[PDB]
Amino acid sequence: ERMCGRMSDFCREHKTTLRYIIWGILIAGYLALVIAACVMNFHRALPLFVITVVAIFFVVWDHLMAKYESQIARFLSPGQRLLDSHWFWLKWVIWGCLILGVILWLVFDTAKLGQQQLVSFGGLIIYTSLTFLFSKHPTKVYWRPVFWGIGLQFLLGLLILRTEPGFMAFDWLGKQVQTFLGYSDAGASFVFGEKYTDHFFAFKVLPIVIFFSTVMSMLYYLGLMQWIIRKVGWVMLVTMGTSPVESVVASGNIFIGQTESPLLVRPYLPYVTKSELHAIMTAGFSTIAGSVLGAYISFGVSSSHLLTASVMSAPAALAISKLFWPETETPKINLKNAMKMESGDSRNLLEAATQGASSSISLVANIAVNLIAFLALLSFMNSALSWLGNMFDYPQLSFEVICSYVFMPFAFMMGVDWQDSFMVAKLIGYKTFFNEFVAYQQLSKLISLRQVGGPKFVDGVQQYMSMRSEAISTYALCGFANFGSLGIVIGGLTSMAPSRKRDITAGAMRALIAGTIACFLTACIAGMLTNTP
Amino acid sequence: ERMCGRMSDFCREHKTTLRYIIWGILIAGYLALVIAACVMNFHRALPLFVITVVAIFFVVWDHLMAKYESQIARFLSPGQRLLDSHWFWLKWVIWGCLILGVILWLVFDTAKLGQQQLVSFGGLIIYTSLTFLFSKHPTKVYWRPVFWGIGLQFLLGLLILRTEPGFMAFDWLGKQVQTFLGYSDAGASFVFGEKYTDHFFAFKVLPIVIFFSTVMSMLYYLGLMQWIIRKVGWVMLVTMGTSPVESVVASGNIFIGQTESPLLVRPYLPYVTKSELHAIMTAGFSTIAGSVLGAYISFGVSSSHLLTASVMSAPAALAISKLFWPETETPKINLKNAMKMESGDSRNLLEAATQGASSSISLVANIAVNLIAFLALLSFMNSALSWLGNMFDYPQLSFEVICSYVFMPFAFMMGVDWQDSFMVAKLIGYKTFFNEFVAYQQLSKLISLRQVGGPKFVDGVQQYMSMRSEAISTYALCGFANFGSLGIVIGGLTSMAPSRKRDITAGAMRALIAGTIACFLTACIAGMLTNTP
Amino acid sequence: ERMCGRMSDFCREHKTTLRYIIWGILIAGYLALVIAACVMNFHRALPLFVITVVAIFFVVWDHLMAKYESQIARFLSPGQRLLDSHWFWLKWVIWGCLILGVILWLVFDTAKLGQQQLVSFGGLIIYTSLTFLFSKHPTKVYWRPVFWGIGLQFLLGLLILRTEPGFMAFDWLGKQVQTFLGYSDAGASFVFGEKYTDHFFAFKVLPIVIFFSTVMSMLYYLGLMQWIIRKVGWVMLVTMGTSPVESVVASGNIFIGQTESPLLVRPYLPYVTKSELHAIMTAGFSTIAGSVLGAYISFGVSSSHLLTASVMSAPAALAISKLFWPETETPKINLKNAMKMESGDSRNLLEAATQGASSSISLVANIAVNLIAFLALLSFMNSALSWLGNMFDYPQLSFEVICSYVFMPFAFMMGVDWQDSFMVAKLIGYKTFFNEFVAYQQLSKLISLRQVGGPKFVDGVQQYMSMRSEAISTYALCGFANFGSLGIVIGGLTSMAPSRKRDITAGAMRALIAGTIACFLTACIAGMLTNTP
Numbered sequence A, B, C: 001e002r003m004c005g006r007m008s009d010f011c012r013e014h015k016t017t018l019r020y021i022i023w024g025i026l027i028a029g030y031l032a033l034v035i036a037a038c039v040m041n042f043h044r045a046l047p048l049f050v051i052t053v054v055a056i057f058f059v060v061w062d063h064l065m066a067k068y069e070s071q072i073a074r075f076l077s078p079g080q081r082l083l084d085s086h087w088f089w090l091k092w093v094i095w096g097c098l099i100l101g102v103i104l105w106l107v108f109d110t111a112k113l114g115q116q117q118l119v120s121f122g123g124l125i126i127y128t129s130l131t132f133l134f135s136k137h138p139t140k141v142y143w144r145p146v147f148w149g150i151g152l153q154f155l156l157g158l159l160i161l162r163t164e165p166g167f168m169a170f171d172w173l174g175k176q177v178q179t180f181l182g183y184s185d186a187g188a189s190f191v192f193g194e195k196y197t198d199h200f201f202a203f204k205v206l207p208i209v210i211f212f213s214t215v216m217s218m219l220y221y222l223g224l225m226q227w228i229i230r231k232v233g234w235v236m237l238v239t240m241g242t243s244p245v246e247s248v249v250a251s252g253n254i255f256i257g258q259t260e261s262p263l264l265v266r267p268y269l270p271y272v273t274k275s276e277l278h279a280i281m282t283a284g285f286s287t288i289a290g291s292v293l294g295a296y297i298s299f300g301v302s303s304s305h306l307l308t309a310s311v312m313s314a315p316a317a318l319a320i321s322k323l324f325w326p327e328t329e330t331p332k333i334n335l336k337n338a339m340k341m342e343s344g345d346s347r348n349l350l351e352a353a354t355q356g357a358s359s360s361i362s363l364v365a366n367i368a369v370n371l372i373a374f375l376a377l378l379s380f381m382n383s384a385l386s387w388l389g390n391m392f393d394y395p396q397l398s399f400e401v402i403c404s405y406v407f408m409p410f411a412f413m414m415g416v417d418w419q420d421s422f423m424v425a426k427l428i429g430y431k432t433f434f435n436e437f438v439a440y441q442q443l444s445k446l447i448s449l450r451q452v453g454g455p456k457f458v459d460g461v462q463q464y465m466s467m468r469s470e471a472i473s474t475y476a477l478c479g480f481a482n483f484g485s486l487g488i489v490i491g492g493l494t495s496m497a498p499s500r501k502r503d504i505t506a507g508a509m510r511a512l513i514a515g516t517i518a519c520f521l522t523a524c525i526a527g528m529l530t531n532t533p
């Protein structure tokens, strides 16, 4: 017993020092492995060396910003005062310079590119104007979030699309995510056997979703996801000027699904204002999760375009949300509380993985049941429309025919050419009434038809559309905004915050409309930047 | 801003007028489409014209009954007083006339028809007498509900079976329902692939259930289901004299499943009396849902017989409920509250569809798990009985052999001939211990064997039974009354009304027995009316 | 009415007499059937006669012990007093005799058997010593439970393994269980079709689990399971000296899963001491449920070894629990309350079956989702380790390679030979990180490779291992202790006893360690007793 007591006392004395020493030893061993790998063959060790260098740089940056925050603020303070003193006259100069730059760039670039590249900008203006017309509180609107959101969308699109080094990186990331979800697919062969490929949707895709959920739970436990969310949220906060919680949610939704994104700020969900809740819902509807990215890339959709649309949607979502539902009440939640995100209660990484996997049970069942019901309803609608048309000697009437004409103006305003506008409208209708999976499947069929080659017109029916229309469709359809998703989001949010149940239902439909409009704005910018083939 | 305010004021002024104008314009457009279709070719447009005519007739009837209710009541009032004044002597005359008519009809028709058809009437009397013997409160019984229920069953059966125009309509409706669910069958190919036919029960049937649930939720939101329920409930109320809530529930169960039927009067479940709760459970157990109708028709079961049994069961269920558990306490719930049914809270039709689809998740899983467990138990029971019989040199002993002898008297009393009574008893045992699905499957196998033709007796074992026995089996087995299904009904009812859990548990078994007896009474009437082949 | 009243009075008078008479008549009929079967052919009727004889003997024994308990206690009392009077000097004599017998038995047998058999006893000593070193309260320990637990384990292993009559009985029981669950396998063909064999794990095994749950619920309602639990618990209580509640829980866990084990003493969970809660958790972690027994036997694992390990684990679990976390506070719960177990509230057997089947829905879904997630994580881990190894010119690095070296000492201390220690270590790592199912699958693959025959070494990689190593692996891996089960057990126990939630969370890891240590002790005993092939 005496030896046990002495050992306990010794452990108590050196606890912090022992933890520091063991962590340092582990880090030193990792560095030794890296240096040995570099010594043996640097070319093979290049990725590990790059990862180590970037990790060290980020850690040093974080430590410096933490420790020296006061000094940096003191250094920045005089500049802010000088700018404020001269701001009154200088604001007009800045605005005039920005307008002149916009005019010059638009004229030169878009005029040289062609007429269609300019209709995209026209559609962007039209969409922003229409959102302003039908706003909840038109009189009280803050234009800084809207203008900064559009500017950030433009800058990100310009960098990613007009620069080859930017273009390649997103393709590389898309390939990596596809490979990760391919690893996901293989693991599900055990449970359902090697004949799991027979039932493609139920066996591959739903385990893909489950594995993504488990991985996200594990990363949340480790504390990586939170870091990236904080970085992007700080960028949006320091530029757009939005509230902290809505910014954090918007940053999270880029790689998190709509259902699980509010869990980031669940503890403060009861106290959020109506505007912030509408912003949360709009961000949820306007961005897709990482799980579907692999499947969509597999269909044939471009990885770079998908990732660019996902990144660009969040600023668009916030801007459109602010313009649609401007805030009229003070925000109670503080920045420090919002940025802080509680880690998983799971004791160890494997418990976090188990808890993350278990949650997915409901989601897959809901998705499958909803798909079955809505596809059956679509078949019945097609049969009934065909029956009705036969009376008037037009037996070809169907859901697709109606949706082609109904949604054509939106496709045309986005910058698609006249002929392909109907085809894009069909996809937009499929995305609206049914989940985007089917619309992306149709788009992949069209892309395959174009790639194979052959007659553009087998008969008076067009078979495939141009590359630029495909890019614009990829941007437009990158969202979870569906008439079926409306119910599940309402249910989940009301479950998280029962007190706010009355508020959640009121703003859901406006949130869905705002999400669709944000997708349209992203498509407009992409069309404006992409050249005609 | 001023223009927006003026527009808002103008919209506020004409709100009701604008809604009326837009609805009228839509109706006028529909009428124009109908008239154009009739002009072009009346023969093709015949169904649309008939539907429009019947809809207009029903709308006008409803409007007139609403507006002129007081005038009609005033006109009816003197007749009621005159009847009441002379009722004392006239009641004996009416009863004697009814008895004489019953005697004449029974004698002529059944005596000419044969002996077996008369045993059906004998069995009807026997079942009613036995129910009266073992009533909860034999002294206090109201015979008007029982007599009116039997009379309505007889009238509906007579009309549907003995008249060709009545017989054809129910076949037509059965075909329509079959096609309507076939639309669901196709829709589930997407989720489970084109090889879904490999696993027949799990893939086709459960999506059939899901689609039926979604369609029922959508119709409930629109407000059609409620209309038919109100009409049939009013008929039963004005003839049988039962309480309003039980009548509403019974009318709904004709096309609604037992699990979802109480949702019609969910808000008033806490305050219902014990007798009304027993009536609800009996109505739930004695009728089948619309979802299984398509599958059962597909197996080979006659559509007209299935629909006729479903329609006839509800009056039988109410009459047997009243006789078995007569009410001894006053009914609190009013007619207006009961007939009024709150529409779905879903904001839009598609939200209603999603919510209806989501609820079905539990039901399908419960059905699958229960079927797996009970079929495994059946296999074990057969193996153990065969093992025991071999000791006594009878290795063929099995569940079917015992159930053939055990349930033979019930089959014989229903009017089935002596030879086929054992085969009907096997089906009755399968229906009692396991769901009606397996029993209908066996009946379909027997019907196919009869239709193919061949030896009636391959050996001393009979292979198939006569057509009339098949009809009586179709009537007898049209119910959801099973031992396995007892638990789920109790769970659902307790979930809806936690306060009444003690009342729910006490009366479940009696309700199940009452439902089985109501099914037997319907089978007896069908046997009485159907001629010997 | 008067006749009904007279009948009711007559029934009330003879209630108890009538019930006794009807039960006696049924028993007499069963006896007549048995005697007729014996008359016709005794050889065929042997099993039924044996079952009847054993049942009669057990009923008579229970009745006699009930009625004559006071007389037996009075007869036993003088012996207890005489032993207590002379215990002071006699205890040393007893301990010395036990030690001398242990020395003689160890020397004579093991020295003859070889070096390998003795390392198992050495490992047993090492494990006990290590558990004693790191005890929660090392100063205060009661050694009688530990010594008696080890003695009972040794005796049971000796009887079952070294005697042919004992060895055959467990094989017979295993075959019976395998057939009993093969009955379940057939029953699931209906729901999933005759092509259910295509998806082996999802369709066969999960229905096996469902059927086991249903049968266990039915037996719990009938009241058989409780009888066996009481008998074994009384044996453990009268020999080991543990508290009644922990003994009751441990005895049940032999054939009951960890999740449902505390429901036996749920009402008293709030008042249990910390040590008793630790014992409950340890017993839960160290034993497998009956459902997996059929599947594991089907894979090829020996039935006798599986059943022997399951039986032996509970005494080992209790002994290790007491040694690791000794009790420091008084037990409030009484023996009578603990032994008494409330029966299921289900009204009839079929309601119990339905309720048992319904409960299994969550378990199967959780198991499938966890398997998918963890297998995907394993694939990703193997790919990443292979990528890292290639940099250092060792592309074969993988999870198996690391776990072979990491867990080798544990395998060696159990008595496995040097060459097979690494192969056993891979299985131990699989069991620790993932559920025992995958480890047993790998063991079955190895057993099949051995049985088929061929090269022991296709190359410098060993292909299959010896029989004794397979037996030791079977003993070692018979547990539910996994890093993922940590969360599920904590959640389940905390759901039952919110008051003790903090204690449940505090003492989970120690129980998880103790379960693996107890499994290792059982494996050590099995290795010590099993001869080298």
Ligand SMILES: CC(C)C(=O)OC[C@H]1O[C@@H](n2ccc(NO)nc2=O)[C@H](O)[C@@H]1O
Residues within 6 Å of the ligand: A205, A209, A212, A256, A257, A258, A259, A289, A290, A291, A292, A295, A363, A367, A435, A436, A437, A480, A482, A485
């Ligand atoms: C799984 C994908 C390929 C699919 O075809 O499903 C369609 C619907 O699944 C919803 N969904 C999906 C993922 C997620 N988190 O990863 N949260 C969601 O809500 C979402 O509404 C979408 O429309």
Ligand SMILES: CC(C)C(=O)OC[C@H]1O[C@@H](n2ccc(NO)nc2=O)[C@H](O)[C@@H]1O
Residues within 6 Å of the ligand: B205, B209, B212, B256, B257, B258, B259, B260, B289, B290, B291, B292, B295, B367, B435, B436, B437, B480, B482, B485
């Ligand atoms: C689904 C059919 C084809 C089947 O084979 O399963 C039999 C069991 O399904 C229950 N059931 C069915 C439908 C419904 N609403 O549409 N409510 C229910 O409860 C019903 O009680 C019976 O026991």
Ligand SMILES: CC(C)C(=O)OC[C@H]1O[C@@H](n2ccc(NO)nc2=O)[C@H](O)[C@@H]1O
Residues within 6 Å of the ligand: C205, C209, C256, C257, C258, C259, C289, C290, C291, C292, C295, C367, C435, C436, C437, C480, C482, C485
């Ligand atoms: C079930 C078999 C076929 C399987 O492959 O999965 C293994 C996992 O199933 C858990 N399990 C199992 C039974 C039970 N009660 O009978 N309670 C449980 O928790 C337990 O954790 C184990 O690891």
